[PDB]
Amino acid sequence: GTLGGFSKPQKTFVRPGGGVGYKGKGVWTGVMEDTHVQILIDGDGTSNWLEEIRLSSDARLYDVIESIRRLCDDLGINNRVASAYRGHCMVRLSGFKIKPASRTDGCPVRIM
Ligand SMILES: C[n+]1cn([C@@H]2O[C@H](COP(=O)(O)OP(=O)(O)OP(=O)(O)O)[C@@H](O)[C@H]2O)c2nc(N)[nH]c(=O)c21
Numbered sequence: 844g845t846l847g848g849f850s851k852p853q854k855t856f857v858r859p860g861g862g863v864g865y866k867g868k869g870v871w872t873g874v875m876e877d878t879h880v881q882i883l884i885d886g887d888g889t890s891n892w893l894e895e896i897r898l899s900s901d902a903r904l905y906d907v908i909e910s911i912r913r914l915c916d917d918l919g920i921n922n923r924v925a926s927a928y929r930g931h932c933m934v935r936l937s938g939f940k941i942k943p944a945s946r947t948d949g950c951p952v953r954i955m
């Protein structure tokens with residue numbers, strides 16, 4: 844179902860010992876469940892996390908969240924970090940679960 848890729852790849856980097864990781868700002872974009880999606884990502888060299896989710900529509904919201912969770916498993920990206928981004932949302936996503944926008948955990952789910 845999911846189709847997309849990195850419109851802004853994170854930085855690929857080499858760790859001591861030769862391992863290849865990803866860090867810094869990135870953007871993944873594509874279509875999940877008939878919805879255009881942008882996922883803004885950051886990472887510090889030890890983990891990678893969601894900063895914001897941007898959707899073209901909420902018509903398939905909970906299905907899109909499940910597709911985002913599955914993609915984040917493949918990309919090694921968590922939803923445990925409290926993003927500083929706020930505004931333009933009714934809900935945030937935290938641990939891949941929907942929370943009211945009043946909360947501070949996780950990241951906004953912004954319908955554009
Ligand atoms: C570019 N990139 C690649 N990956 C990881 O590597 C998988 C393949 O990611 P990919 O489809 O972008 O292919 P590739 O990394 O080989 O890029 P190419 O060589 O130019 O064709 C992804 O499913 C992730 O596990 C990445 N994972 C993260 N977190 N961030 C990135 O920017 C990233």
Ligand code: NA
Pocket residue numbers: 887889890
């Ligand atoms: Na970290």
